[PDB]
Amino acid sequence: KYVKVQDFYDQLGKYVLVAPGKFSGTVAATDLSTGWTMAWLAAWNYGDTCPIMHHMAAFPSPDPYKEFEFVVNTQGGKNLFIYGVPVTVEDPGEGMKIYRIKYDGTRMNLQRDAAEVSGLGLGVHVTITPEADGYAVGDGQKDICAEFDRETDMVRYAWAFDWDPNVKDLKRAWLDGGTMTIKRLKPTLPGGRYDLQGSAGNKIDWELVPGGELAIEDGKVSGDRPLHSVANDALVFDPRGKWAVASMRLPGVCVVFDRENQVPVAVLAGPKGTPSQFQLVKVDDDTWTVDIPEVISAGHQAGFSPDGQSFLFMNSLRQNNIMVWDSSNHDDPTTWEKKAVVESPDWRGAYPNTFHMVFTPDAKKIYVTMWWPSPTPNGIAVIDAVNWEVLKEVDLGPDMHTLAITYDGKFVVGTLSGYQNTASAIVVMETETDEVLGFLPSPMGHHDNVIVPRTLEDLRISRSTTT
Amino acid sequence: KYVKVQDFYDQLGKYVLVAPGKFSGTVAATDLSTGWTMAWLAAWNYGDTCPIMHHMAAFPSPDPYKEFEFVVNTQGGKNLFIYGVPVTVEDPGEGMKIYRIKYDGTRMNLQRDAAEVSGLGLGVHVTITPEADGYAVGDGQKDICAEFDRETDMVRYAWAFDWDPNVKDLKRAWLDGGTMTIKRLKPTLPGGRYDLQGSAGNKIDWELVPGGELAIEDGKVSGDRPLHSVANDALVFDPRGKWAVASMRLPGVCVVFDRENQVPVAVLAGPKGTPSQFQLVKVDDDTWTVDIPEVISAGHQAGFSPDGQSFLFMNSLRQNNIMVWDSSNHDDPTTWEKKAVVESPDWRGAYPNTFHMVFTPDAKKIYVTMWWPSPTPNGIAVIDAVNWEVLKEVDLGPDMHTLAITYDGKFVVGTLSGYQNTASAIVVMETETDEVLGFLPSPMGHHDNVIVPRTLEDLRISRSTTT
Ligand SMILES: [Cu+2]
Ligand SMILES: [Cu+2]
Ligand SMILES: [Cu+2]
Ligand SMILES: [Cu+2]
């Protein structure tokens, strides 16, 4: 007679979608086998006065439906003013919170704020270590990343990054190059803690938007110290262990760190045209530098294929493509060498902007975001990861964000977020012939989403090895 | 191969569902033809410091996808402490806002706070007048209801209700009878404004929950004036025009009001066992009284069938049934006689509590809510409104709130809201053989929802004639 939406959910199976909602100030888990939201959480109700719920990542649980834990961070300050919502809050809080929350089989519970426990507030990407024993956050306003311990929320190590332009004027500070310093950040407060919550640390007073390097160069982004900015975005993890990679938007490079010995060991150069790497120079036991002749393009998204064998960093802005290194040699990242660039005619200038990606478990395909400012249709591009070529692009709607995949490989689940004021949805695509099955309602401006992994192997294609 | 969710939405058609989300702080509209959320608004963004978004109702729009306008009010104070979210807020806002919001075919726009325009702040049911030229709001803490003009947001008339118990002890205050006063409530501030925003007016410090009539009796509800409460809930409208009916929870009556002459004309007695009406006595030009020998039962849900020929009030609490009156004589409500009572073996003392309803366009059936405290399954009873009998009950999940219906009469659309901390959903049932088609995600604690009407006729089965 009639069609039952339960038939759609029957095919997706018992996966748990989690996603935060940015200006909605909520986070929510959804049952993809029934269409229910399992639980949601409103941070205002906990006294947060700028609850911009931003990025997030879930630890694996053997049964997400009885329990799971996740990490979700917030942004604050003038970040509240930069989207199209005519916000009337005067003096909002400062965000940079890192909330630990546990779903217990009925409700979500706010465990604590890790930014308080560690001393270190960081407001961009959140990922889980491949061993599920901790997590990392990055922040492009203060240019710090750190890997924290799951059980205590204390920082295992934290790196601060600094730019020293060869030309001291914002228009040229990146294009004509400079030296980046890589600096061990050491705790300064009792108990092993930092003094870097909320805005403490900030160089620029809000996070650079997609294309937002142009803005910083044109002197349109305020802050104390924009000339020193690199805009770190993320620390993503090699699935094989040992190394974590920090992405720096403005200087177009990624830094490979030794997690156990807490040194950086290599710098990979993003733009097509430049070598595989630049030279890392140790200055002292806590200080390294790297010189860059010119920044030919800012980069964004960074991540490893599930087997560890390829590493990717996206050029965005002046170039627009995916640079791929061969990371085959687990024993020494200073050998990792460029082996492929994914290019496509429509990939010119800042838009479409490729800010997020997910591999299929066997690693032969990639789903990658194509973002544009309103009104141009946003979408997904499907990449052949064996030959490194675009297979197809699907237009979907406004403001495309992240992409997650069911662990059996079969369905891609993505979020579009209305720029915080217009249409928002969850999108489902099947990966056998890459077609959209449609949209589920989602009143939230998500800039992240995940499916709760069950095993350490599922994390290799979740929020761990890519953003 | 795969089922597309678009197939389920193709059978629903271009209807727009709207609902607010109570603790979530937000409000959202969904395109039931594509699964997208069309847009959503987070009240914290406009500086509201207790954005419990409560009840709402939408003006008809000839094309809602192009634009439509709605009203959504808030609660604050200690309402924020009444649910199991371990809220930690120091100085919560007082709530009782009445927002005017307009969707402009891209975004939601906050137009203003009707409670600041009028001075009169009310936080329970919001309904639209059948001519779509104004709206009404009730409040069970202050015991006031009013009709507001749509263009100016100024009060057309408002009424204040007061209880004068025969026994001055909260335990007997309603059981052993009393007198209720109906007072015309007049502006005290310049320009025809009230001085009654926020907590001003409050007799008890929070709204009574389902079954909370026993809490007030037991001295569990603090406030300044509990012995005087009646807990007004709503002012629903005869779809034929002329009359509005205010429901009074604690004394178990409804008062019929003549909208244009600004006087009450009749009082309907809810519990089975009592006559059709108690006698309204005029005291002076602004004051009427009505005596009740004893209150056998509190009531709650109240509303008209779409042709106006039947009027319903739900006994909850000490009886649990639907009382029905013959309202076919539109010239004189003092002739409305009880004509039936719907009863069911399971409907004994408070739970399930039947607090929400919607009619089919032809008025031949009613979908009514059945609410229990966690953990018993809440759901929907289907009522034969030709013979006044229950047809079936369907169990759904936690915390069942309101129901709407598509104006072609084909699909019933309801909200479950997880007691603000667990599972939430929208549910879809087809009215042809009353089977549930399944659930769409909705991370929101809705106590309201509407499908946006397109004509005046549509309002006869929207938030106008029933809550
Ligand atoms: Cu990023
Ligand atoms: Cu973001
Ligand atoms: Cu009610
Ligand atoms: Cu309510």
From TrEMBL, chains A, B:
Cu(2+) 7 binds at residue 90. Cu(2+) 12 binds at residue 330. Cu(2+) 1 binds at residue 7. Cu(2+) 6 binds at residues 55, 207. Cu(2+) 10 binds at residue 228. InterPro entries: Haem_d1_sf (IPR011048), TAT_signal (IPR006311), TAT_signal_bac_arc (IPR019546), WD40/YVTN_repeat-like_dom_sf (IPR015943). Cu(2+) 11 binds at residue 316. Keywords: Metal-binding, Signal. Cu(2+) 13 binds at residues 330-331. Cu(2+) 2 binds at residues 22, 54, 447. Gene3D superfamilies: YVTN repeat-like/Quinoprotein amine dehydrogenase. Cu(2+) 3 binds at residues 54, 207, 447. NCBIfam families: TAT_signal_seq. This is Twin-arginine translocation signal domain-containing protein. It comes from Thioalkalivibrio paradoxus ARh 1.
